[PDB]
From a paper:
Plasmodium serine hydroxymethyltransferase (SHMT) has recently been shown to be vital for parasite growth and development, making it a potential target for antimalarial drug development.
The structures of the PvSHMT–l-Ser and PvSHMT–d-Ser–5FTHF complexes were used to assess the amino-acid binding pocket. Although the stabilizing interactions are from identical residues, three major differences between d-Ser and l-Ser binding can be observed. Differences in the accommodation of l-Ser and d-Ser in the PvSHMT active site may account for the broad substrate specificity of SHMT and the lower catalytic efficiency for d-Ser in the THF-dependent catalytic function. The crystal structures of complexes of PvSHMT with l-Ser and d-Ser–(6R)-5FTHF revealed that the arrangement of the residues in the amino-acid binding pocket is restricted by the configuration of the bound amino-acid substrate, leading to different catalytic efficiencies towards each substrate isomer.
Numbering used by the authors:
A (entry chain B), B (entry chain A): 1 to 442
The structure:
């Protein structure tokens, strides 16, 4: 007593928009550092009937029965996860049930410190995430600033983690957890140095490696598992999995942490796990362990280095003057334009990027930079030689943005009016669409 | 630069378990009240590339661009949701971004009352949900008892909502929100009477209709939208959508509640939405509005009443002695066996049900009932005539549980040891599999 007909027939309206979205994705240079493209195998898992199943609890400890095949899945996932992050099932556990990055951070932080607990994270404007305790003046923007009491460290005017001010704030504030690993940070992290600070104050060490997860797994960047009490990561970014998150906890360093994490997740915050997510994560983590994926992650870095260099060769300033990873932040002051405008300009030419604040930006109102990343384009088969074109396209957009601001003024509402019809952008869009459209596409 | 080969080829290990799980679902009488089976179109949407997209924010108000086809999807979903629940976009708004029911309740409750705020909900043992403020003595089990201050009302010894005790409690406690709509409640709800109580104390009316959502959409049961400030529902249960949740808010009664709900969701709790969930909800909501779905929901009710009647004709007791909805709770005292045991016995015969407490149960240790529901079986084509067989299978299972408790004792560990190899269970399992395996299966 149901409808069997394909999505096409059952709902042609939705299939219209979905087919369109697919086409935009195919015909875009996607530089959103936090984006990637899933293969059909990860998407078969997301569309699998395994999500019919209520499975509150953990393997071998379910509230409901009929959960044998689900137990095997969740365990296959936890194993594949510990293997991928080169870490022993005797020193480290994983929780695979967090529905997304933000959920996973809220949960882990609660487990460690509880309500009213004291947390420290990098400010959003300096490259930290919302769930690292972000707040405005009096307005507690993130639950992590309201549920916990939080203080935000900044980067120095060069764009690097101000480790000294982290100390000067740590002793001042006496936190129970300090978070590192970031939303927009183009360099590697000194986990060791964060460990030093954390000991001095009896604090937990939280590493959110969501953006750099692959580097950590493939031993290309610093290992946080050597110093961290908890590591969290999303699975949809450089990891190239589904939209989901993982919580890692060092038991061999921390008393009953397995308990605190696993019950923060359920039943403190979540109910039924989404088993299709768990299935999809499992499938990707297998790929993650293959050396073919290490080949991919390397290519992500080589592309990022080549893009940084080529942008610099066109006299474009980069925050920290380069990259250690997948992510670049362009400082635009030199051209007297906002990241706000440049985003709008790149939208018109099917180039996906987003505005990003720079150290000298006081407010978050009109950021002077943009964040770009290479994982999605690397997935589509772009190599170093291809980074010059992307760099050139970006430089053309920067210049156009300069011209269009000279005609229509500084206020963004006005600027946007200059975008449609512009002969140049229409020509630049087609170059993009033609090169982007014909790239490998999972 | 990716692996394109089907899940079958790329990962044979996972495909095995998934095919197994699928076979288990086909060969099971699934009586889990909160479970259903999604059609192929809902699963195509869950497996769609729309989840490659970061879409933090709301339609026309995103942080990143390239979000035009996402915006159309989220709006097509919000529309279809208001339509389905027979409510106008001028009095009521929706948020379609909560990842699951628990997140949705935590989010809605914070939006209304904030940290340290006061909430009333039905106790779990009485039929309430974890996110309705659940706690043990000193042990804040659910975040909803920790980040809020919560007090729990019970049901009377007949199994009904003790509206009088709710008053006795509302005046003593003075909460900012009272929750109704339940995990395990076999009767309709007096929303009007909850409204009256909330007025007397200046509290919000929160209705979680996750279990009965379809009934409310098809004007088959009482309408909470008439009296409630906030209505939450999951989409994976009787609604028969994906694993996701909806938050409804009465703006034409409540100030800037549109803002308060929408920002509790993002950026307080969540980050990027899971657009594939949004897409899948959109698709199911279309189906929900069809009169064919009203037919299905009616059948759910008829089947449920037929099952209750048949159980009673075989001298089996039911809490409240019947049902108004999809859900029955069997009282087992009469037989001196637990729900815990019957669950285990029903597992052995591919009959999915879960244990459930009755009004006279002191603790959660060893509940004296089971909860069953009809949505899943109705989806698989079962009609009123078919309920007799299901009732008969349950009666035979109750009897076997009685015989096995007599042979192996009362402690559950010992009892389970009696299950494997039992000639009767193997015979009864086969009867189940034969009839279950050949039922329509989306
Ligand atoms: C470092 C970090 N950690 C967590 C998250 C949350 O992921 P969700 O699945 O969206 O909850 C993010 C998200 N980052 C976005 C911006 O918010 C991005 O585009 O980088 C993150 O960066
Ligand atoms: C009434 C009600 N509200 C919320 C939830 C939470 O849904 P999740 O999607 O699991 O977060 C439930 C869940 N119900 C389970 C038992 O907890 C069920 O089998 O009934 C719910 O009932
Ligand atoms: Cl999903």
């Amino acid at each position: 007593m149901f409808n069997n007909e394909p999505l096409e027939q059952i709902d042609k309206e939705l299939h219209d928009i979905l087919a369109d979205e697919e086409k935009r994705q195919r015909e875009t240079i996607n530089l959103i550092a936090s984006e990637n493209l899933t293969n059909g195998a990860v998407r078969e898992c997301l569309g699998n009937r395994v999500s019919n199943k209520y499975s509150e609890g953990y393997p071998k400890k379910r509230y409901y029965g009929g959960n044998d095949f689900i137990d095997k899945i969740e365990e296959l996932c936890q194993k594949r996860a510990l293997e991928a992050f080169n870490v022993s099932d005797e020193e480290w556990g994983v929780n695979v049930q967090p529905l997304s990055g933000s959920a996973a951070n809220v949960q882990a932080l609660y487990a460690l410190v509880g309500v009213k607990g004291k947390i420290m994270g990098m400010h959003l404007c300096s490259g930290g995430h919302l769930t690292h305790g972000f707040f405005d003046e009096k307005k507690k923007v993130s639950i992590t600033s309201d549920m916990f009491e939080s203080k935000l460290y900044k980067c120095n005017s060069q764009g690097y983690v101000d480790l000294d001010a982290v100390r000067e704030m740590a002793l001042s504030f006496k936190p129970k957890v300090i978070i590192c690993g970031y939303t927009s940070y183009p360099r590697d992290i000194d986990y060791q140095q964060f460990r030093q600070i954390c000991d001095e104050v009896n604090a937990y060490l939280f590493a959110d490696i969501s953006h750099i997860s692959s580097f950590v797994a493939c031993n290309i960047l610093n290992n946080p598992f050597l110093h961290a009490d908890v590591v969290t990561t999303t699975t949809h970014k450089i990891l190239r999995g589904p939209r989901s998150a993982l919580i890692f906890f060092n038991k061999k360093r921390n008393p009953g942490i397995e308990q605190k994490i696993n019950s923060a997740v359920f039943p403190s915050f979540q109910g039924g796990p989404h088993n299709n997510k768990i299935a999809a994560v499992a499938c990707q983590l297998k790929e993650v362990h293959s050396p073919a994926f290490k080949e991919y992650t390397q290519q992500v870095l080589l592309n990022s280095k080549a893009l940084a260099k080529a942008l610099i060769s066109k006299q474009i300033d980069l925050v920290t003057n380069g990259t250690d990873n997948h992510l670049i932040v362009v400082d635009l002051r030199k051209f007297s334009i906002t990241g706000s405008k440049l985003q709008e300009t790149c939208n018109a030419i099917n180039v996906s990027l987003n505005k990003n604040t720079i150290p000298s930006d006081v407010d978050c109102v009109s950021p002077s930079g943009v964040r770009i990343g290479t994982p999605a384009m690397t997935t589509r088969g772009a190599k170093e030689k291809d980074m010059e074109f992307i760099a050139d396209v970006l430089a053309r957009a920067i210049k156009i943005t300069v011209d269009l601001q000279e005609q229509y003024g500084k206020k963004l509402v006005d600027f946007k009016k200059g975008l449609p019809g512009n002969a140049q952008l229409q020509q630049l869009k087609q170059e993009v669409v033609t090169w982007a459209g014909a790239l490998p596409f999972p």
